[PDB]
Design a protein around this ligand. Structure first.
Ligand SMILES: *[C@@H]1O[C@H](CO)[C@@H](O)[C@H](O)[C@H]1NC(C)=O
Lengths: 198, 218, 213
């Protein structure tokens, strides 16, 4: 037995979201989760589940549930899926093919845009190789793009790896800030600790 | 249970080389980023290098770029650190640390016991074990003096480690001569002196010296 | 590099006291700051990850808080088994960096050191040197003066001290002083003693021995 209601508000209604390259993860355990306050909320532009059906989610029990949250522009939310390619999927957040979980996104223009463009939200534009699934890279080492070594951006063929989104509230919807939460359901050959209601 | 065990620490000349090993057990090694973190004696902590689960991505601190190389064989559940061009400043205890989630650059949840890497031009020296005998106020003290050794560490136990109450093994001190001097004491009821047997066990891995000295009243 | 600064460098509190350590980041690093404990001669302890998340199997008296630049680590009730050095670490960028560490000690009742003196062993004299050994066992506070007395004469520049970390049980310290000299100078003199001054003493206590029993 266990009585706690899982703290999804901590992750969803959070004030500051992570830059996609340095994405955040929260462990959700020893609590009970009513998923109906998620797929029945009219707040989300995207709610796409894999290996599970969202309707039939309150009937299962998991060892742990992990929530990865970050921000990208809307035209890139399609990359947050198994087998996707592109800047975000290749250099920032790659989901595996065998992925089991739900991917949730919603417009955060009222929250993440400047007048003038929000430069705090960043994404990786250069990397020597693609990420493994669920791999993370918060390095800011200057990107060598020629045969010549690098010190700072001022060097030739020395690019700064990160790029700013510059979120303005006047952008097209495809350039607008979209907050993304990705749930992975981890069921191990260990006692389950996060269950649906009843 | 998760276990990280480090190995390879020893004494090397400046400019020498050394390969650290970290044996992992209790979890799916191939799915966690691993990291190396060192600690100079009596100083804070310094992240050294990180390797991703598959081993495809590696990251180093600037102070060790191009000299050190992190690597892993997910087959042997082993993490490696290859250190070349060692300097006196690399003298530290080295830990392998697991990433909390395994993705990378999260909290270090599991640490090994450490292994000590001393970089010095000085030569290995085994110590000398001199007993400190009681003659002292209802309770009596007795001990053994571990003198003239290099490098660290020496492990001192009492009665093979079965006697721990009232034991006080002091941190080593570096005497003028560039050698270490350590002391270990234990307090005991004065009614046990000629009756009980108290053995000082001193073990010095670098010099392969195992000494068990009996402390008796004089 | 993000430079993390810890305050205080060291603190002493009574058993059961509430204890608060802060880490100050050199920039706004959001909640990207973990907390570690390291007991003497042991490896680090992951205590708090992100800014406030308590790791599995960690006592509930430990809790983290803060965000941005100032982060707080809190012991609700300080226990003798908490004697360790606490480190903050930043999680926002490479290189990952630690605070210089904060050393926690226990403020306890004053206790006077039991004082013992040891003459050089008869095995040691053959090797040609002699080390005299004074021991100060189980005392608080940490600080005390040891004085070496060769025929009432003040020695100095020839004796070394070493101190143990505060015992996790009775919250006390121990002190070993080793005054070394060559076998030759050992025999020429006769009366050896250490005079130890401590707050827990009425008047400076002296332990003595006679060269040659
Ligand atoms: C966020 O707050 C709104 C309004 O208070 C609430 O309807 C919603 O359920 C909250 N989100 C979560 C995940 O609890």
């Amino acid at each position: 037995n266990i009585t706690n209601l899982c703290p999804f508000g901590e992750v969803f209604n959070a004030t500051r979201f992570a830059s996609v390259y340095a994405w955040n993860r929260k462990r959700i355990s020893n609590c009970v989760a009513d998923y109906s306050v998620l797929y029945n909320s009219a707040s989300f532009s995207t709610f796409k589940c894999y290996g599970v059906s969202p309707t039939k989610l309150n009937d299962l029990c998991f060892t742990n549930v992990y929530a990865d949250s970050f921000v990208i522009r809307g035209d890139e939310v399609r990359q947050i899926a198994p087998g996707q390619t592109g800047k975000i999927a290749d250099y920032n957040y790659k989901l595996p093919d065998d992925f089991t979980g739900c991917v949730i996104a919603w417009n955060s223009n009222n929250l993440d845009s400047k007048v003038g463009g929000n430069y705090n939200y960043l994404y990786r534009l250069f990397r020597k190789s693609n990420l493994k699934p669920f791999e993370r890279d918060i390095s800011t080492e200057i990107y060598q793009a020629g045969s010549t070594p690098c010190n700072g951006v001022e060097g030739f063929n020395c690019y700064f790896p990160l790029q700013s989104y510059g979120f303005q509230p006047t952008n097209g919807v495809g350039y607008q800030p979209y907050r993304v939460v990705v749930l992975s359901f981890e069921l191990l050959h260990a006692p389950a600790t996060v269950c649906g209601p009843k | 249970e998760v276990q990280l065990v480090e190995s390879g620490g020893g004494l090397v000349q400046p400019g020498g080389s050394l390969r650290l090993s970290c044996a992992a057990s209790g979890f799916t090694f191939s799915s966690y980023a691993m990291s190396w973190v060192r600690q100079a004696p009596g100083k804070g902590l310094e992240w050294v290098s990180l390797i991703s689960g598959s081993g495809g991505s590696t990251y180093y601190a600037d102070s060790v770029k191009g000299r050190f190389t992190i690597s892993r064989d997910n087959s042997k559940n082993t993490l490696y650190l290859q250190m070349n061009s060692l300097r006196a400043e690399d003298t530290a205890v080295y830990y392998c640390a697991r990433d909390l989630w395994g993705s990378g650059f999260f909290a270090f949840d599991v640490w090994g016991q450490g292994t000590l890497v001393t970089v010095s031009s000085a030569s290995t020296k085994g110590p000398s074990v001199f007993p400190l005998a009681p003659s002292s106020g209802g309770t009596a003290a007795l001990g053994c003096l571990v003198k003239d050794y290099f490098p660290e560490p020496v492990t001192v136990s009492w009665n093979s480690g079965a006697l721990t109450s009232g034991v006080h093994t002091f941190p080593a001190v570096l005497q003028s001569s560039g050698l270490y001097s350590l002391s270990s004491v234990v307090t005991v009821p004065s009614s046990s002196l000629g009756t009980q047997t108290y053995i000082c066990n001193v073990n010095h891995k670098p010099s392969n010296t195992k000494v068990d000295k009996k402390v008796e009243p004089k | 590099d993000i430079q993390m600064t810890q305050s205080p460098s060291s603190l002493s509190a009574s058993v059961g006291d509430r204890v608060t350590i802060t880490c100050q980041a050199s920039q706004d690093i959001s909640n990207y700051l973990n907390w570690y404990q390291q007991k003497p001669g042991k490896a680090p302890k992951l205590l708090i990850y992100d800014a406030s998340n308590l790791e599995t199997g960690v006592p509930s008296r430990f809790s983290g808080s803060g965000s941005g630049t100032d982060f707080t680590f809190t012991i609700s009730s300080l226990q003798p088994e908490d004697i360790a050095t606490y480190y903050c670490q930043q999680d926002a960028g490479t290189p990952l960096t630690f605070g210089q560490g904060t050393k926690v000690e226990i403020k306890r009742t004053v206790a006077a050191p039991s004082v013992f003196i040891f003459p050089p062993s008869d095995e040691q004299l053959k090797s040609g040197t002699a080390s005299v050994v004074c021991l100060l066992n189980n005392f608080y506070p940490r600080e005390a003066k040891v004085q070496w007395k060769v025929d009432n004469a003040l020695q100095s520049g020839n004796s070394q001290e070493s101190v143990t970390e505060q015992d996790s049980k009775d919250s006390t310290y121990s002190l070993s002083s080793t005054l070394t000299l060559s076998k030759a100078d050992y025999e020429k003199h006769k009366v050896y003693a250490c005079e130890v001054t401590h707050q827990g003493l009425s008047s400076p206590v002296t332990k003595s021995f006679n060269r040659g029993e």
